[PDB]
Amino acid sequence: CRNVLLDPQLVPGGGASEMAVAHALTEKSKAMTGVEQWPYRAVAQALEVIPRTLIQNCGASTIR
Amino acid sequence: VKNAIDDGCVVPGAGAVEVAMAEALIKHKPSVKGRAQLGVQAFADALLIIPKVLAQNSGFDLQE
């Protein structure tokens, strides 16, 4: 109720948004070429592990 | 293929016969007396090892 008072806009997601942040970094990792991209792409790898773990409990080839 | 000229019946293998045996063995007791069906249960579960773990090695685990 504070959030819908804060933001009527809101995203979908079940951890899929965390992937969507993670892939948006990876595109800008390859777009903003230079010394910055190697820490900037490494933290993009850290985000996708969490919804991977949520579907790991669901149970499949979660890496695929 | 020496065996192929020997027989007349070439069968789809790789696990196709393996679960097909274990369906008939467990569900239909051949020797419905309970002493031998104990050995049937070990026998039909022996058949599962070839399709289940090579696919599990491939990434789609044994239960799927």
Distance in angstroms (rounded) separating the CA atoms of residues A32 and B54:
43
Distance from CA of B60 to the nearest CA of A (A): 6
Q: Which residues of B are annotated as a binding site for ADP?
A: 14
- Residue among B64, B54, B49, B39 at smallest CA distance from B18: B49
Residue B21: partners with Cβ closer than 8 Å, 6 or more residues away: B44, B47
Burial of B52 (0-12, 13-18, 19+ CB in 10 A): middle
Contact yes or no for B61 and A61 at CB 8 A: yes
CA distance A52 to B12: 36
CB < 8 Å from A in window 4-63 of B: 59-61
CA-CA-CA-CA torsion sign (B22, B26, B29, B32)? positive
Q: C-alpha distances in angstroms, A50 versus A10, A17, A41, A59, A63?
A: 20, 11, 16, 14, 12
For residues A28 and A36, what is the distance between their CA atoms, to the nearest angstrom?
A: 11
Q: Could you tell me if B18 and B48 are in contact, meaning their C-beta atoms sit under 8 angstroms apart? A: yes
**Contact (CB, 8 A) for A47 and A21:** yes
Method in brief: cryo-EM
Chain A residues within 8 A of B59 when measuring between CB atoms: 61, 63-64
Name the one residue in this structure whose structure tokens are 């002493």. Answer: B35
B7/A57 Cα distance (integer angstroms): 48
Which resolution in angstroms does this entry have?
Answer: 7.8
Q: Does A9 touch chain B (CB under 8 A)?
A: no
Q: CA geometry: angle at A56 spanning A38 and B56, to 5°? A: 100
Inter-chain touch A60–B59, beta carbons under 8 Å: no
- Closest-CA residue to A14 (of A42, A43, A44, A53): A53
Contact B59 A61 (CB under 8 A): yes
